[PDB]
Design a protein around this ligand. Structure first.
Ligand SMILES: Nc1ncnc2c1ncn2[C@@H]1O[C@H](CSCC[C@H](N)C(=O)O)[C@@H](O)[C@H]1O
Length: 468
């Protein structure tokens, strides 16, 4: 019992024309998977060759999210037409691991080794790369001072080694950053430009497949309850995808390539497809599409970027505040059968209303638990206030984000200063759901939304009780 697909939407939108996404097919999904693996490999080689580091953990996935905020290109997953070319997300994450990645410390000896490793790497940087005379002498002095300190007889504590590293990094940081800046920007640009080449290859392959199938690739005022994204281009024929179950795991094989999903999630997808798909009355295309869906999300992940909410919390959001819709979800993790998601081309068959920034409700009660991408969260806040100010119909958004204050994300600061904020509180932080400080819960509502779904004391109390 991890979802409630019986709850009907109360989201109201203007009727939309069907979307122009090329309809998914496992042949194309497999190629996109193989090229995205190669792209991650290029990123690994660039980080190693240019800066001697591993790719910062989760940075490639966060890059995909940031790029999609601005991407105007043709692929549902990979970026190809972005201004600016250099991702501020990837740049920021690589620079934080220069000249080395700081790892977790448990023991005094691990702290001493990390401090030495930092000092040694900063020295090799200054010895082997172009650096201004001012920056060179400052780093050289700090490295030499640290090595002299480590040379002393009587040893210090673990906390003293950690404090020495924090101070050393504070002094060297800006100088090391100035040495590596142009190199790091070059990694960000190159991986974007390789992505664009791969996107062109996938696009041509997908166009050629639809032509092989003899498939042609060539109202705003009416308000309706929301409905899944529909594709204007007819879908290609089903392909051969084989299903069998092993130990409650659904195994789907396309041309020898296997993907797996739990039996419970599989049965969920079958139900979402019954509720959401209108072009496949005999389920002939169902296994082809489930294979594409699982593969797409496996590729997106690559096998610390998002968190989920416990079922009793969604029950309380629906019962106390009328929530029927998730602004950020996937067919695999949604609680409601109506939600926005990253991949309209494949997720629409399973209930997706498309990406959130392209979704424009006039009314409804919503929950939002975005992935941890600062750029996406900032666009989300702008989108919230645009929608809340465009409509006088009841409109509410209940938003869950990490309570981070060192420094706070621009999104969290803007939401706390919003003219639509009706309430704010702290609930326990995101934890692993089986299916650091805390979680900020922010209520953004227009006048009509505040009248209909007011966060009264009793309603807030029942929502808090859903954690107890
Ligand atoms: N542009 C976008 N629009 C809507 N959802 C998006 C998105 N980009 C990423 N996502 C999705 O946002 C989700 C955040 S995890 C949220 C889990 C769960 N639905 C909950 O509300 O608690 C992920 O499934 C992620 O793929």
């Amino acid at each position: 019992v991890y979802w409630d697909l019986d709850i009907q939407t109360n989201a109201v939108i203007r009727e939309r024309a069907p979307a122009d996404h090329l309809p998914p097919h496992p042949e194309i999904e497999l190629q996109r998977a193989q090229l995205t693996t190669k792209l991650r490999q290029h990123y690994h080689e660039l980080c190693s060759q240019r800066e001697g580091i591993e790719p910062p953990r989760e940075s490639f996935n966060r890059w995909l999210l940031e790029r999609k905020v601005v991407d105007k290109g043709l692929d549902p997953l990979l970026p190809s037409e972005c201004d600016p070319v250099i991702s501020p997300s990837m740049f920021r994450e690589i620079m934080n691991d220069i000249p080395i990645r700081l790892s977790r410390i448990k023991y005094k000896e691990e702290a001493r080794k990390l401090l030495f490793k930092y000092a040694e790497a900063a020295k090799k940087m200054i010895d082997s790369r172009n650096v201004t005379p001012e920056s060179r002498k400052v780093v050289k002095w700090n490295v030499e001072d640290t090595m002299n300190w480590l040379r002393r007889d009587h040893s210090a504590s673990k906390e003293d080694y950690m404090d020495r590293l924090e101070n050393l990094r504070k002094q060297c940081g800006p100088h090391v950053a100035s040495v590596a800046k142009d190199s790091v920007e070059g990694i960000c640009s190159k991986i974007y430009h390789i992505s664009a080449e791969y996107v062109r290859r996938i696009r041509q392959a997908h166009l050629t497949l639809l032509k092989e199938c003899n498939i042609s690739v060539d109202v705003q005022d009416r308000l309706v309850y929301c409905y899944p994204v529909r594709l204007s281009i007819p879908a290609p024929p089903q392909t051969r995808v084989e299903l069998h179950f092993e130990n409650d795991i659904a195994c789907l094989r396309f041309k020898g390539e296997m993907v797996k999903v739990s039996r419970g999630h599989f049965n969920k997808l079958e139900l979402l497809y019954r509720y959401s798909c209108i072009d496949d009355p005999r389920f002939e295309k169902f296994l082809s599409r489930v294979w594409c869906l699982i593969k797409r999300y496996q590729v997106m992940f690559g096998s610390g970027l998002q968190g989920s909410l416990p079922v009793p919390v969604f029950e309380a959001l629906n019962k106390q505040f009328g929530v029927t819709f998730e602004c950020f979800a996937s067919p695999l993790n949604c609680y409601f059968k109506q939600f926005c998601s990253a991949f309209p081309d494949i997720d629409g068959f399973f209930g997706s209303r498309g990406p959130f920034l392209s979704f424009s409700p006039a009314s409804g009660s919503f929950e939002a638990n975005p992935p941890f991408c600062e750029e996406l969260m900032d666009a989300m806040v702008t989108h919230f206030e645009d929608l809340l100010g465009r409509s006088s119909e009841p409109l509410s958004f209940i938003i869950f984000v990490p309570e981070w204050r060192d420094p706070p994300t621009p999104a969290l600061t803007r939401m706390e200063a919003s003219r639509f904020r009706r309430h704010q509180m702290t609930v326990p932080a995101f934890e692993h759901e089986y299916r650091i400080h805390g979680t900020a819960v922010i209520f953004l509502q227009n006048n009509a939304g505040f009248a209909k779904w007011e966060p009264t004391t009793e309603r807030i109390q029942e929502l808090l009780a859903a954690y107890k």
